[PDB]
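Response to reviewer comment R2.3. The reviewers asked that we include at least one raw input/output pair. We reproduce the pair for N5-carboxyaminoimidazole ribonucleotide synthase here without editing.
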Amino acid sequence: HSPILPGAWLGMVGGGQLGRMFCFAAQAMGYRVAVLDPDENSPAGAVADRHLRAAYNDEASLTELARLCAAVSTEFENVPAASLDFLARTTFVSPAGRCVAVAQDRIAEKRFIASSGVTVAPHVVIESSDALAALDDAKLEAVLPGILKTARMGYDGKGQIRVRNAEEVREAHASLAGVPCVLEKRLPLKFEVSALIARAASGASVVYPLAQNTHRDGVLSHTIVPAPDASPTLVQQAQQAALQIADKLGYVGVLCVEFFILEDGSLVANEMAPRPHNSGHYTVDACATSQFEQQVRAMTGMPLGDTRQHSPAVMLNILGDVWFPDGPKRPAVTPPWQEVAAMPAARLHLYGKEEARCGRKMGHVNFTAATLEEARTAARDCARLLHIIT
Ligand SMILES: Nc1ncnc2c1ncn2[C@@H]1O[C@H](COP(=O)(O)OP(=O)(O)O)[C@@H](O)[C@H]1O
Ligand SMILES: [Mg+2]
Ligand SMILES: [Mg+2]
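Raw output as returned:
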């Protein structure tokens, strides 16, 4: 892989905020970015050097992208793997379609992570309605109460149903149109962490500090780095687990592995994203090389960057709910960005999305300071200001 050098065209399939932040990282280093995204108002397309407005399976546009670009990546975990494989006929694609196919499918993903030597949650695979019908209630009850999750196309807790007995499992599967699913035992979670790694085609890799993540209603709310409740041993285990998965997968790119720490202290792998991750946004303001720059480096065959964290950090997600302080049925109110910007620790990142909607990710604020407790305190003050907390 002769390295792809500054000045070249780099392709990005998907045009959300992750693709937008990739654009800034690539363009700062002198690359040009072509974004393929069907939406006219794409956050990434708005800043890309070129936006191909097309469906992710459009043959002509895929051909155009691969002809223009020396290397192509994605920011969209649910992208069709066949689109990445089509692109790889004529250009370098990182991560490869085969890797994305494993990570985007909960059944394949749990099997693969287990086969890497990493513990996953107790679960029952439900391949089809016919298969579920043949399972006895005891086999379901062994992982109940639990969560029925669609194997494909879930994000932000969607495609998931709580289930408390075998009958609810069967009704839930019908409610999900009978698609393949995983039934996971609900575990007693003490805290959640994510390991962020980048891996080059050579097998070289870098790892970030462990991020400690808090979710509300299944959506990431904030991230604290380095994880205050993760001992050096656990940090080491979680990092090695992500690297073992990435090595076995032949993964080239940025990989984020989410973990549970249970009340008994055990580490359980939840899922992985074949891309930069919401819980890695802090790297932009806290680390030498951001996760977006690692994606550039991995896909170009350039050396991976240093992951040194120069400042402790907290990321606070900004959902569209913040625009509705008087409730969703009342008019939107522009959030107090002038008061956020008056906070010394605050690094404001807004995605350029036109319409604020509840549940929609509109931005994030990174808080950096000399000490983690100063950053945590600032993020709490900002959360109260925005009515994220009381
Ligand atoms: N087996 C489980 N036990 C307990 N909590 C869980 C389990 N699976 C998921 N959760 C909770 O729900 C959140 C979202 O589930 P996850 O499968 O990660 O959804 P998504 O893929 O949409 O991000 C997790 O971060 C975790 O807090
Ligand atoms: Mg996944
Ligand atoms: Mg998750």
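Residues 258, 271 surround magnesium ion (ligand 3) (CB under 6 Å). Residues 232-249 form the longest helix (18 residues). Further pairs are available on request from the corresponding author.
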